[PDB]
Amino acid sequence: SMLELPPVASLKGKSITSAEQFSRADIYALIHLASAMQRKIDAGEVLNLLQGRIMTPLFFEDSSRTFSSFCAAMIRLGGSVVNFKVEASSINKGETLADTIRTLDSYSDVLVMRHPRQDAIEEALSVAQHPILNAGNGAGEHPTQALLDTLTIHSELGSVDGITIALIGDLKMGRTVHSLLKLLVRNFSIKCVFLVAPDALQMPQDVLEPLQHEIATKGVIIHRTHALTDEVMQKSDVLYTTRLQKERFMASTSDDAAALQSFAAKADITIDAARMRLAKEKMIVMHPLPRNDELSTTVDADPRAAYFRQMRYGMFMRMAILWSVLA
Amino acid sequence: GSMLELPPVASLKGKSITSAEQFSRADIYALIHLASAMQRKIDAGEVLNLLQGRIMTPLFFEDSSRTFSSFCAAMIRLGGSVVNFKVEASSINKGETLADTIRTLDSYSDVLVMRHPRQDAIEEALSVAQHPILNAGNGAGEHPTQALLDTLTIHSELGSVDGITIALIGDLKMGRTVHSLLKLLVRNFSIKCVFLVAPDALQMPQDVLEPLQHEIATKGVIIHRTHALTDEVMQKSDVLYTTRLQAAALQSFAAKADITIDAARMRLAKEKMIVMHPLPRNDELSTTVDADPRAAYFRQMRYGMFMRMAILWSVLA
Amino acid sequence: LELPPVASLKGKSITSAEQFSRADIYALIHLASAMQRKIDAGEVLNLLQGRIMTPLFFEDSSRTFSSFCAAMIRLGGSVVNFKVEASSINKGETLADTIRTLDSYSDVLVMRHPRQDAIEEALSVAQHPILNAGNGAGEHPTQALLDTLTIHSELGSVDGITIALIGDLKMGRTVHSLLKLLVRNFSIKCVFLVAPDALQMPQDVLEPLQHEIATKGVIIHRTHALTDEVMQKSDVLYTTRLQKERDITIDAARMRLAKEKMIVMHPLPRNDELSTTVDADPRAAYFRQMRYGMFMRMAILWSVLA
Numbered sequence: 015s016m017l018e019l020p021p022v023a024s025l026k027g028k029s030i031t032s033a034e035q036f037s038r039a040d041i042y043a044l045i046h047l048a049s050a051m052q053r054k055i056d057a058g059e060v061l062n063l064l065q066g067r068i069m070t071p072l073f074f075e076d077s078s079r080t081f082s083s084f085c086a087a088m089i090r091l092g093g094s095v096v097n098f099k100v101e102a103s104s105i106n107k108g109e110t111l112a113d114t115i116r117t118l119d120s121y122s123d124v125l126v127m128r129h130p131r132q133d134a135i136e137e138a139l140s141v142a143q144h145p146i147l148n149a150g151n152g153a154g155e156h157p158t159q160a161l162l163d164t165l166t167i168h169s170e171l172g173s174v175d176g177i178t179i180a181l182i183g184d185l186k187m188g189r190t191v192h193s194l195l196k197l198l199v200r201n202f203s204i205k206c207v208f209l210v211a212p213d214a215l216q217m218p219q220d221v222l223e224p225l226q227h228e229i230a231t232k233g234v235i236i237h238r239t240h241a242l243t244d245e246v247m248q249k250s251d252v253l254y255t256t257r258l259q260k261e262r263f264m265a266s267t268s269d270d271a272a273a274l275q276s277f278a279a280k281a282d283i284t285i286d287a288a289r290m291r292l293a294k295e296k297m298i299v300m301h302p303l304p305r306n307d308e309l310s311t312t313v314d315a316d317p318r319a320a321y322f323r324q325m326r327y328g329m330f331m332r333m334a335i336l337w338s339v340l341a
Numbered sequence: 342g343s344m345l346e347l348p349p350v351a352s353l354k355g356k357s358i359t360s361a362e363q364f365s366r367a368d369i370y371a372l373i374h375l376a377s378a379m380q381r382k383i384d385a386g387e388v389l390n391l392l393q394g395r396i397m398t399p400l401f402f403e404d405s406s407r408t409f410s411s412f413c414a415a416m417i418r419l420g421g422s423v424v425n426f427k428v429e430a431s432s433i434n435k436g437e438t439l440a441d442t443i444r445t446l447d448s449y450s451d452v453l454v455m456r457h458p459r460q461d462a463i464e465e466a467l468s469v470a471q472h473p474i475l476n477a478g479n480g481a482g483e484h485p486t487q488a489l490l491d492t493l494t495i496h497s498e499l500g501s502v503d504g505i506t507i508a509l510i511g512d513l514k515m516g517r518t519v520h521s522l523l524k525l526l527v528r529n530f531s532i533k534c535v536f537l538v539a540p541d542a543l544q545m546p547q548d549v550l551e552p553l554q555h556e557i558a559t560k561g562v563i564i565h566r567t568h569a570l571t572d573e574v575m576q577k578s579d580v581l582y583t584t585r586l587q588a589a590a591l592q593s594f595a596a597k598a599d600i601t602i603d604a605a606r607m608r609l610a611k612e613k614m615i616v617m618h619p620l621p622r623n624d625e626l627s628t629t630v631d632a633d634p635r636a637a638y639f640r641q642m643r644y645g646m647f648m649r650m651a652i653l654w655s656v657l658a
Numbered sequence: 659l660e661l662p663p664v665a666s667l668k669g670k671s672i673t674s675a676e677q678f679s680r681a682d683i684y685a686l687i688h689l690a691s692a693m694q695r696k697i698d699a700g701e702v703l704n705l706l707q708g709r710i711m712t713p714l715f716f717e718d719s720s721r722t723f724s725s726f727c728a729a730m731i732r733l734g735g736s737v738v739n740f741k742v743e744a745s746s747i748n749k750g751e752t753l754a755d756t757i758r759t760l761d762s763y764s765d766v767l768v769m770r771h772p773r774q775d776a777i778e779e780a781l782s783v784a785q786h787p788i789l790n791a792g793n794g795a796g797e798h799p800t801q802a803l804l805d806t807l808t809i810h811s812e813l814g815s816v817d818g819i820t821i822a823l824i825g826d827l828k829m830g831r832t833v834h835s836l837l838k839l840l841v842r843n844f845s846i847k848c849v850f851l852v853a854p855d856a857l858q859m860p861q862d863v864l865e866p867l868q869h870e871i872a873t874k875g876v877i878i879h880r881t882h883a884l885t886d887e888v889m890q891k892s893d894v895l896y897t898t899r900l901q902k903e904r905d906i907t908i909d910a911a912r913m914r915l916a917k918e919k920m921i922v923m924h925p926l927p928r929n930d931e932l933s934t935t936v937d938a939d940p941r942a943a944y945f946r947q948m949r950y951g952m953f954m955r956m957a958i959l960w961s962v963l964a
């Protein structure tokens with residue numbers, strides 16, 4: 015209870031759209047703030063930092079973790095939430111996205127927006143007076159997931175510089191791995207990244223190209239594979255795996271069918287207890303969730319399974335973010 | 342010192358809100374001044390604890406963005422709480438009736454906010470409820486709190502409500518907002534002129550106009566029906582209040598372009614006037630108007646929150 | 659201070675009527691009464707400020723969802739409004755993973771599920787207490803507690819009553835928990851089981867109770883009708899709806915046969931088994947029952963999270 019909760023001043027009043035916005039020092043300030051929030055909350059302390067402030071969720075596509083995490087974080091800061099549901103709104107009388115933004119912006123202090131269109135967040139930004147926090151924009155980015163994933167690595171392993179990390183699964187559509195790769199390469203001295211995915215679902219060039227300067231000058235090693243090889247298993251300090259983003263492959267064309275099929279047919283990427291016999295002693299398995307069969311329930315009892323603790327780090331990072339934006 | 346800064350409107354204490362007809366001119370002004378004061382405190386960053394421990398339950402049988410969210414935000418900004426009941430996930434799917442649903446919410450709540458597709462639904466709810474019910478829209482009947490926030494908007498933007506010329510535009514037949522607004526303005530203020538701008542099949546109902554004939558006569562209000570935003574409607578109106586289309590189809594189509602407000606049509610409007618829309622809008626109110634200082638239909642929603650604070654506080658004080 | 663939590667419930671999941679002792683039930687009853695006095699006098703409680711309940715409803719509710727949230731709020735607590743329809747279940751997430759998810763952020767989970775054994779599977783992974791708000795045709799333990807608060811407050815005594823349990827007793831999770839709670843912890847004079855044969859109280863509820871039934875000498879009679887005898891002797895007529903998703907009507911005419919001092923109860927919602935003509939009778943306790951439910955849920959949440 016003697017710990018301060020200094021807001022991160024550079025976040026004040028700003029929208030959060032991309033992992034690109036953050037400096038290394040922003041990241042560590044949010045990490046220590048989140049960690050102090052965790053200590054206070056776990057000790058049973060009641061925070062009243064955002065009394066009388068309102069978050070409104072605008073979720074134009076589904077969420078459990080993200081919506082609930084954000085609501086919980088707001089509440090644990092003493093904040094409030096208006097439970098707006100897009101599916102039961104005047105969008106059903108033809109209301110536009112822009113008008114819907116202005117509508118909840120009339121009542122709220124912060125908007126949390128998730129949308130299947132990558133450019134919808136920009137549209138919202140151009141009409142909103144209050145900050146908007148990007149909780150996922152199609153296959154674009156998920157910048158607060160990247161921050162909490164980094165809190166997880168820091169808290170679990172004790173260090174982010176020097177790690178070897180595998181990014182596994184649907185890298186093409188994974189807004190989580192897009193933001194995470196950006197945030198780690200821009201701001202830390204990463205030893206090596208394994209990009210583990212079948213050919214069709216590899217990390218996009220529009221993510222890798224902007225990073226090419228920093229990759230080359232910081233000496234980050236980048237290796238593509240289509241499988242969890244013995245080498246990937248033995249060298250990785252972090253195995254970060256992801257779900258096939260099937261709802262992004264809905265055009266019913268021969269290509270979407272072949273891309274959907276590649277996860278199981280063009281790659282060997284399942285993590286289970288058999289495969290975990292190859293891992294380091296000091297390493298963690300992470301997954302943004304939800305998972306399907308790429309991450310077996312046989313790993314759940316393993317102490318290196320960090321994907322449940324990841325969600326709780328998530329709540330505290332979101333608290334740190336909300337307090338900083340709104341202080 | 343909240344009785345100096347935020348005194349509740351006594352006449353509203355513990356009462357249900359169902360119709361624009363139930364308010365006096367003094368009621369309206371007291372709500373306006375209270376709403377202005379709520380706004381000043383909230384905008385200054387001050388945190389209100391007036392309704393801590395009190396619960397509002399929204400009971401929305403129709404879709405809403407403004408009215409649902411507005412009411413929740415207003416309750417929360419008063420320090421109160423909201424129980425997020427949703428009809429579609431409720432025991433109504435086990436054959437439960439409307440009176441029983443009301444009694445249920447009534448056992449937990451301090452105030453109910455009800456929107457329903459049927460006009461007589463409020464009367465049924467009232468006959469059974471022990472706590473106040475606020476009518477958030479009853480079929481094609483009324484929307485009494487929209488009429489209050491609309492009046493707050495006029496008052497705050499133009500300085501005065503007496504003496505205005507207002508056009509009510511669009512689907513006046515099914516528009517519960519214009520039914521409530523026409524009643525609140527004509528009953529309580531001295532309006533100079535109302536233009537009722539609609540194709541014939543969607544004109545203002547007689548059941549709204551006939552009970553008003555006495556106030557119309559005593560105050561000498563001028564009422565003109567048009568099927569277009571004519572040069573004259575555009576030149577004389579202090580307020581253009583337009584609405585979304587909710588024989589009627591054919592007349593609507595034929596009139597659409599003539600009742601559309603866009604930047605080209607605004608070249609004929611007064612320098613000092615406002616465009617209002619309770620929202621949501623479709624094509625009858627062009628996005629080309631959004632940058633015009635006279636476009637008041639976004640600020641109108643924020644006035645709504647403060648007016649709803651004023652209402653909730655007066656009801657529950 | 660004036661609202662001592664029930665110590666035995668601290669940090670515990672609530673899954674069955676069986677887990678309560680008579681002393682537990684009375685401590686909750688007196689706590690719920692004290693909570694009701696403070697709330698009805700206008701006092702604001704701040705007991706659970708900063709604590710979160712997440713409802714996890716895999717089926718429809720009106721009363722149960724609302725009264726849990728209202729109770730939480732009136733203790734000063736907060737609610738995270740998780741929806742199953744708008745969630746990552748649609749992306750393929752399992753029930754266990756869903757539980758772990760709400761568990762990362764919440765202090766207490768309130769779970770309702772069409773599968774009888776989903777609550778057990780939930781408990782095997784949750785760190786925080788789960789309150790069973792109804793598991794299939796199994797139990798509804800907090801309904802049985804509020805029903806007993808209702809009987810206590812309305813009649814003054816639970817020992818000695820004659821109670822009729824009426825309707826769909828086979829699928830009625832409410833009458834399962836309530837029979838268990840009454841028979842184990844009180845000395846009931848007589849239970850009428852009023853149901854057609856196909857919907858009678860199940861053997862898996864009656865058999866575990868046979869020892870208590872026999873040693874307290876509870877009378878148990880099965881009928882398929884609300885006979886004049888049931889009507890004249892019952893202190894409580896507890897009636898229920900046909901559980902469709904899985905001569906008994908009470909109307910003003912039938913009520914001419916009831917005692918002066920008795921109550922009609924119904925967990926709700928009702929269909930035509932309980933006529934609107936009964937609603938203005940002072941013995942119609944089924945609306946007041948919902949309000950006792952809110953206070954008993956306050957006593958429960960406070961005791962769980964103190």
Ligand SMILES: N[C@@H](CC(=O)O)C(=O)O
Nearest residue numbers: 150189190257302303304
């Ligand atoms: N829940 C995360 C990961 C996923 O959906 O697979 C997201 O929305 O991006």
Ligand SMILES: N[C@@H](CC(=O)O)C(=O)O
Nearest residue numbers: 478517518585619620621
């Ligand atoms: N939102 C207003 C007007 C409209 O729907 O167009 C109402 O609910 O009545």
Ligand SMILES: N[C@@H](CC(=O)O)C(=O)O
Nearest residue numbers: 792831832899925926927
């Ligand atoms: N509402 C009670 C009784 C019923 O549904 O009829 C239950 O959930 O079990």
